[PDB]
Amino acid sequence: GLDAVRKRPGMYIGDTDDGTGLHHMVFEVVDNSIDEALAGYCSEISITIHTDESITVRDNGRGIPVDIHKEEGVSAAEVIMTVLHVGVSVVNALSHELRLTIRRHNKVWEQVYHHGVPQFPLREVGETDGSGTEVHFKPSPETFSNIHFSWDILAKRIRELSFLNSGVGILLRDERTGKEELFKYEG
Numbered sequence: 001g002l003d004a005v006r007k008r009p010g011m012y013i014g015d016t017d018d019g020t021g022l023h024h025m026v027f028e029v030v031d032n033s034i035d036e037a038l039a040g041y042c043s044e045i046s047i048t049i050h051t052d053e054s055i056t057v058r059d060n061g062r063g064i065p066v067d068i069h070k071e072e073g074v075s076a077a078e079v080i081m082t083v084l085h086v087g088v089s090v091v092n093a094l095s096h097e098l099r100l101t102i103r104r105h106n107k108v109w110e111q112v113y114h115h116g117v118p119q120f121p122l123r124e125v126g127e128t129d130g131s132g133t134e135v136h137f138k139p140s141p142e143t144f145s146n147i148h149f150s151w152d153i154l155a156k157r158i159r160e161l162s163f164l165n166s167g168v169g170i171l172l173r174d175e176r177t178g179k180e181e182l183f184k185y186e187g
């Protein structure tokens with residue numbers, strides 16, 4: 001259960017005061033998009049740093065499957081966001097607010113969590129021509145002490161992701177400063 005994760009966070013995410021754990025949250029999310037790239041269905045990832053020190057990750061993969069998962073009773077998406085046994089549930093648990101948006105089967109689905117707790121089941125909220133998964137999460141002040149993300153640190157590790165996963169283009173955007181960079185390795 002997520003209760004333990006919130007109770008002793010450094011054990012799961014990394015040090016919660018020096019920025020290590022805080023930045024791991026971003027790459028905990030991003031790695032799922034990378035897995036989808038390794039499978040061959042994701043070519044584009046974008047990471048946005050918001051003025052309120054929240055983070056948005058978005059990929060262009062197949063979208064998380066949304067049909068009802070019967071060992072739980074809830075959408076598989078909700079399962080993946082709320083149960084593990086690091087995963088993306090760790091990020092969810094340690095987030096004040098987190099919005100999940102899935103584009104799949106030409107439909108748009110979303111769900112909102114508060115500290116890893118679903119506010120409504122995955123619901124359909126529109127039509128789309130795109131596909132992929134988007135995640136917007138705000139690190140909990142109850143967990144991390146100095147919430148400020150570093151362009152430099154995110155930039156560095158993204159450059160390496162880009163370098164190691166040829167053919168994936170990764171867009172980094174900081175709305176605090178308006179810096180913007182697309183890392184794609186085609187040299």
Ligand SMILES: CCNc1cc(F)cc2c1[nH]c1ncc(-c3cnc(OCC(C)(C)C(=O)O)nc3)c(-n3ccc(C(F)(F)F)n3)c12
Nearest residue numbers: 032033036057058059061062063064065080088133134135
């Ligand atoms: C921006 C954050 N992105 C993101 C987070 C996350 F956290 C999971 C996913 C994600 N983007 C994804 N994009 C695709 C899948 C995905 C979709 N379908 C399958 O199907 C599996 C089969 C057998 C059909 C195949 O591989 O061909 N697998 C993964 C996915 N998901 C990652 C885990 C899942 C899960 F378990 F829910 F199925 N979806 C995620």
